[PDB]
Write a protein that binds this ligand. Structure first.
Ligand code: 2YU
Ligand code: ZN
Length: 257
């Protein structure tokens, strides 16, 4: 099945997911000089005060911190978006080395990791129905650079030992995802896709300009996770990112000058 190795990695995915070679694939490189300022963009509204985290799951490819999405409790709106998008999970993609790991790049620059906060458009009733729509998802993307520790990430880092292998999960209530955000909400935006199979072209990408800093030791702990299940030979969960895909017939807009 699909993964990030030599024989099942991003160069293979197109065989089971033909949309891998489609017209609005993610991630892309963000050419800062070509991304036009759009003064019609609104400020981003991130309303996470009432977020209810539930659980953290190692799904064999990343770990997802899941949220209660049965009511409007943590929502994204405004920016490029029409209407309301509810947070359902967040995860990360990261590298084996500090100099790679992000999916989006900025003038070809790779960050050490990238956080994806996944939201679905509440006009479509649930996540499953949202992913059958071209405007079904909004994914807020945040780069991580190695530097000082991010205090608000530490609870996530401390629980990883308990979900080392594929299929393990742990209670993860009362986590405040506001602690993962940078100061500025300046962003670039463009239409794309999930960066993992099924690679569906549902996503308004909103990619923050300001990275967050995490410590060396924080990202080190991400890299001790395993892709394999318990009882199977150890394959470290690192380099679970897809490289930049062709931009094709898309313009990236900037929210800021
Ligand atoms: C919903 C979903 C699941 C996995 N990934 O990587 C992304 S970007 C979005
Ligand atoms: Zn992702």
């Amino acid at each position: 099945h699909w993964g990030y190795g030599k024989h099942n990695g991003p160069e293979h995915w197109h065989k089971d997911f033909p949309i891998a070679k489609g017209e609005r694939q993610s991630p892309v490189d963000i050419d800062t000089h070509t991304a036009k300022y759009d003064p019609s963009l609104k400020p981003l509204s991130v309303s996470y005060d009432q977020a209810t985290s539930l659980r953290i799951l190692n799904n064999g490819h990343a770990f997802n911190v899941e949220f209660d999405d049965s009511q409007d409790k943590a929502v994204l709106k405004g920016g490029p978006l029409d209407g309301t998008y509810r947070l359902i999970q967040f995860h990360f993609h990261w590298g084996s080395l500090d100099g790679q790991g992000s999916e989006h790049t900025v003038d070809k620059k790779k960050y050490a990791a990238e956080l994806h906060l996944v939201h679905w458009n509440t006009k479509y009733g649930d996540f499953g129905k949202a992913v059958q729509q071209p405007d079904g998802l909004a994914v807020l993307g945040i780069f991580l650079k190695v530097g000082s520790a991010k205090p608000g990430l530490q609870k996530v880092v401390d629980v990883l030992d308990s979900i080392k292998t594929k299929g393990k999960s742990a209670d993860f209530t009362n986590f405040d995802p506001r602690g993962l955000l940078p100061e500025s909400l300046d962003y670039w935006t463009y239409p794309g896709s999930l960066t993992t199979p099924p690679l569906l072209e549902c996503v308004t990408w909103i990619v923050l300009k300001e990275p967050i800093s995490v410590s060396s030791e924080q990202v080190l702990k991400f890299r001790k996770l395993n892709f394999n299940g318990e009882g199977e030979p150890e394959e470290l969960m690192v380099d679970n990112w897809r490289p930049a895909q062709p931009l094709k017939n898309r313009q990236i807009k900037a929210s800021f000058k």
